[PDB]
Amino acid sequence: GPISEFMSTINVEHTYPAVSSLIADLKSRKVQGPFAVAVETALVMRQVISQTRWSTVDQLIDTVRAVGSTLVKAQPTEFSCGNIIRRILRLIREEYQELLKTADENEKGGMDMRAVIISGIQDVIDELDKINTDIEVQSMDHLHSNEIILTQGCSKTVEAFLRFAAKKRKFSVIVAEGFPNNQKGSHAMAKRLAQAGIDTTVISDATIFAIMSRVNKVILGTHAILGNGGLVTYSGAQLVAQAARHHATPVVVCSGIYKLSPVYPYDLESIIQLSSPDKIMSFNEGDLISRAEILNPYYDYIPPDLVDLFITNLGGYPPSYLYRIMNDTYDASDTIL
């Protein structure tokens, strides 16, 4: 139930201007990445609650349950958005219920909980600018001296994860430039932690199998996690996964929890987007670009039965325990928007 069936575009553009503004920046990739999508999402919803007129909570539920369905229609693949929404919905119904009970002291109006919801929203914001700090701590309970680590594609969360341990313990790391998309960032990361005193070895995205023979652990930072524990990761990460499984090398994932979403991977072909082929073939080979089929996937998928351990802003947990976070973080009704 999108918002267009509840409010008109002009009204949406008038009362909730930043929404349509964000919707524009969403489908146009003006905003991008999971983190930047999340923070901007809540900031929008903050103003929404800060500038809305309503009475019942049930009608307030129907509103946010509508913009999200529209907001998620923009660029659904960046699930980071919808995850923030369903969090708010439960954050309302349980805040309502917890306040529906104090009023039932002995009475046997019902709104303007505004600033609390805002104060509840800000609690989500301040929680995000922190996941790295909350995650980079559990490193010292896994990475040890002289260990050998493999990791692909400039995941910021993974960067501060290792750099923390590298402050005190000294060890080695192999970095595979997540070609083609994560090329630039990956080299920077390698250059960065190189200064952090950790043996860094940049490789082609293809020499994965060659070195997996003598690799202790492998570490990955995803783009999103789906209801079955599957991972929607950036380009070219199933190789290292399958390379690890073939070598009995364990697979660990260091990701914030906001990237977790209960959407179920019915059809992956509707998930893995495709970017421009410019990233892999120049415009110049005019003969080729006219004679062949060029494709450049942005994301990669790995199934959960290949992950051995997750690293979250809450703690380390096996994939089979992931669901019990969702029910403790989301509500079942808000699976489909």
Binding site: P180, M281, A292, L295, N296, P297
Partner: peptide
């Protein structure tokens, strides 16, 4: 690429993707 060049110069429905897309193709 040179493998693409050859096969194309004989007219074959060819598809060019880097290895980091193996899972897809």
């Amino acid at each position: 690429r040179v493998c693409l060049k050859l096969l194309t110069e004989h007219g074959i429905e060819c598809t060019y993707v880097m290895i980091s897309a193996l899972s897809y193709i």
